[PDB]
Structure formats: C-alpha cells, structure tokens
Structure 1
Amino acid sequence: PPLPEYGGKVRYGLIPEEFFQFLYPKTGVTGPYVLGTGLILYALSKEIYVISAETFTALSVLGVMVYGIKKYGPFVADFADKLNEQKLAQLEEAKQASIQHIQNAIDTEKSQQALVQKRHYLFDVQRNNIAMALEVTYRERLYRVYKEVKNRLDYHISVQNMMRRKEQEHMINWVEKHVVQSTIAKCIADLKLLAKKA
C-alpha cells in the first residue's frame, strides 16, 4: 500500500488547518486568532498560566527549536528524501541486473542449440573422405592396369622399331661396302657427257 504524499497541513507546527476551516463559516478569517488571543489573555489574567522562571526557560527552548527546525529542516528533509531515492535506485538496478543475467542465460542456451544443430559436419566430412579415398584408389588402379598393358605393348613396338633401324643401317652400309668390291664403257661415257655439256 503506497503512502500518501503530504501530511495534514498544520499551522505554526501546532494547530491543523482543519480547525481554521472549521471556524471560518462562523467567525471569518479572524475567528481562530481572536479565540487564541482571548484564551491566552484569559489564562494570563487569571493565573492559569503563572509567569515564572519556566516562562523564560520555555521561551529559550522554543526559540532554539524554531531556529533549529527553520535552519536544519531543509537539510533533514532532503537527507531523508535522498536516502529513499538511493535505496530505490539501488533496488531498480539490482532488479534489472537479474533480468539481464537470466536473459543472458537464455541467449547462451539458444546458442548451444545453434551449435548442436551445426553438429552434422563431422560425419559428412568423414563420409566425404571415405568416398574420395575409395574413388582415388579405383582410378589409380585403372591407370595402373592401363599403363602396364600399354607399356608391354609399347616395349614390343619399340624393340621392333629399333630392330628395323639397326637392320636397315647394316643393310645400306653393307650394300655400299659390297658394291665397292665390284668398264671402258663408262670410261668413254664420261668424256661423252663432258662433250654433251656444251
């Protein structure tokens, strides 16, 4: 339950304004003061209030009290109000701080859920590597079998080629060396062609 804001509107710190309002309708604005004056003067004049040393003790205490409230009343009011504002501000920040802590926890949990949703890459990576290794080995095997069969066939064709080469070389130089082992007709025919040179 919230407190009200203002009190009861006393006057001179002694008499509430309800009394002045209550005597307004029947005695104007000066009714309460005329009544107070009359009662003070009646108490004095009839020795209901005996003037003594307590008159001056009371005057000094009342003066010290009025000066005290008037001078250190603003300070005390503002001190109480600032105490309340500081406790309120501290409580508000502590409330918001707990809100932020639990919101951070919620965020962290949703982040963990994002990770666990990303999990599957480890296993598709392993599957990638298995498939790729098997395919690499398959193609390497097919290249091995191809290249071996082709190498054997090309070794045959290369021995055939260089065999033909060495045989043809021996052929041509043998036939020269053997025609060297083997004609007045050409003797005359050389001069005949020299004559045909013209």
Structure 2
Amino acid sequence: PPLPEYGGKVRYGLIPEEFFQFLYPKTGVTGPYVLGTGLILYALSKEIYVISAETFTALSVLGVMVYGIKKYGPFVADFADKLNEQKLAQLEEAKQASIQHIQNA
C-alpha cells in the first residue's frame, strides 16, 4: 500500500494539532495556550518542577536542538527525498532499458 504524504501537523514539535481543535470549541483560540502558562506557573510555584542545575542544561540542549532543527532541517528534509527520487529513477531507467534488451531481442 502507498504511504500517505503528510503526518500529523504538530505545533512546536511537542503538542499535536488534535489537541488544539479538541479544546477550540468550548474555550476558544487562546484556550489551550493559557492552560500551558497556567500549568507551568503552577508547576514551578508549588515546586513541582524545581529549578535546579538541570534547568539550565535543559534550555541549552533544547536551544541547540531547536537551532539544529531550524538550520539543518531543510537540508536533511530534501536530502532524504533526493535519495529516493534517485533510487526511484535508477530503477525506472533500467526498467525501460530492460525492455530494449528484450524488444531488440
């Protein structure tokens, strides 16, 4: 079977769009967003997510990750395609030739 052509349309690479549409009707556009700020400010206030040394090693490895994606994403995004539309063409080409070796024959 043929694969589809797109995934799940995820926003911020962390929360899928099936969530925003799920809460859009009753709570509106800014519904889920204010939940985020509502949970984060609650988490680090009641010391659920306690600020530690790991907080600043989190932001760094999240900063390098979000910058490596934005700077080297599109290059790998198409390079994974060119490996296919090469392997695809490399087949369709020989496929036609393999007819000449049987049409001439």
The structure with more radius of gyration? 1
Q: Which runs of 5+ in 1 are unaligned?
A: 105-198
Give the Cα separation in 1 of the matches to 2:26 and 2:74: 37
Q: How many angstroms does 1:26 deviate by?
A: 0.7
Secondary structure of 2:23's partner? helix
**Structure 2 residue ranges without an equivalent (≥5):** none
**TM-score for both structures, normalised by structure 2:** 0.98
Q: Shift of the alpha carbon at 1:100?
A: 1.1
Q: Which has the higher contact order (CA 8 A, sep 6+)?
A: 2
2:76 corresponds to which residue? 76
More helix per residue: 1
- Aligned-residue offset at 1:87: 0.1
Relative to the length of structure 1, the TM-score reads: 0.52
Q: Percent identity?
A: 100
Which residue does the alignment assign to 2:4?
Answer: 4
Correspondence 1:1-198 to 2 at 5 A: 1-104=1-104
Aligned length: 104
Q: Counterparts of 1:67 and 1:46 in 2: how far apart (Å)?
A: 31
CA shift, 1:14, in A, is 0.3
Which runs of 4 or more aligned residues in structure 1 lie more than 3 Å from their structure 2 counterparts after TM superposition? none
CA distance in 1, matches of 2:90, 2:40: 52
Cα deviations by residue, 1:122-178 (Å, 9 ceiling, x for unpaired): xxxxxxxxxxxxxxxxxxxxxxxxxxxxxxxxxxxxxxxxxxxxxxxxxxxxxxxxx
